Amino acid sequence: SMEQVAMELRLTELTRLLRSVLDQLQDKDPARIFAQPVSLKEVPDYLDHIKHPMDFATMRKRLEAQGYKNLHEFEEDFDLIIDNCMKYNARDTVFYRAAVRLRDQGGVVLRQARREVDSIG
Ligand code: NA
């Protein structure tokens, strides 16, 4: 149908906007602490601690398969990155401190993206 295509055109535009958002969020991680999943070879007990791991590469695979239906789903995944890190790592570590910084710097990007998604529909 023509409806299904128009729907698909909007998913594709949401995907374009979220791609730009993802890039902007990932620039706030210049150390690449959150680039890739936590290694199970190097942290073998990780899944005893964290039940839903998340990272920027895994968000990128979902993004390019148009797997985010809305911004809420995308933000849930970004918060997992941050929240997992703040639980697994202690306060006085470079990892926890990197999460805090990504959260604070990410918030501004996310604020405007919500406006843009609401505004453009
Ligand atoms: Na902790």
Burial class (CB in 10 A: 0-12, 13-18, 19+), 58: middle
| Cα separation, 33 vs 25, whole angstroms | 13
CA of 94 to the centre of ligand 1 (A): 13
For residue 80, which of 112, 98, 103 has the smallest C-alpha distance?
Answer: 103
| Measured distance CA(52)–CA(27) in Å, rounded | 23
Q: Are 35 and 55 in contact (CB under 8 A)?
A: yes
State how far the Cα of 109 lies from the Cα of 19, in Å rounded to an integer: 12
Residue 62 buriedness (CB in 10 A; 0-12 / 13-18 / 19+): middle
Residue 38 token pair: 């936590």
Q: Which residue has the tokens 């007990």?
A: 45
Q: For residues 86 and 38, is the Cβ–Cβ distance under 8 A?
A: no
| Contact assessment for residue 47 and residue 53, using Cβ atoms and an 8 Å cutoff | yes
Backbone angles phi, psi at 119, to 5 degrees: -60, -60
Give the C-alpha separation, 14 to 71, whole Å: 8
Strand, coil or helix: what is 29?
Answer: coil
CA of 60 relative to ligand 1 center, distance in Å:
27
Way it was determined: X-ray
Which class is domain 1-121? mainly alpha
Whole-angstrom distance, CA of residue 78 vs CA of residue 69: 15
Tell me the CA–centroid distance for residue 93 and ligand 1, in Å.
11
This structure's resolution (angstroms)? 2.2
Q: How far is the CA of 65 from the centre of ligand 1 (A)?
A: 33
Structure tokens at 87: 């639980």
b or e along 75-95 (b: 16 or more beta carbons within 10 Å of the residue's beta carbon)?
bebbebbbebbbebbeeeeee
Ligand 1 centroid to Cα of residue 73, in Å, is 25
Listed by start position, the domains of the chain span 1-121
Distance in Å, CA 89 to ligand 1 centroid: 5
Q: Rounded distance, CA 26 to CA 60, Å?
A: 11
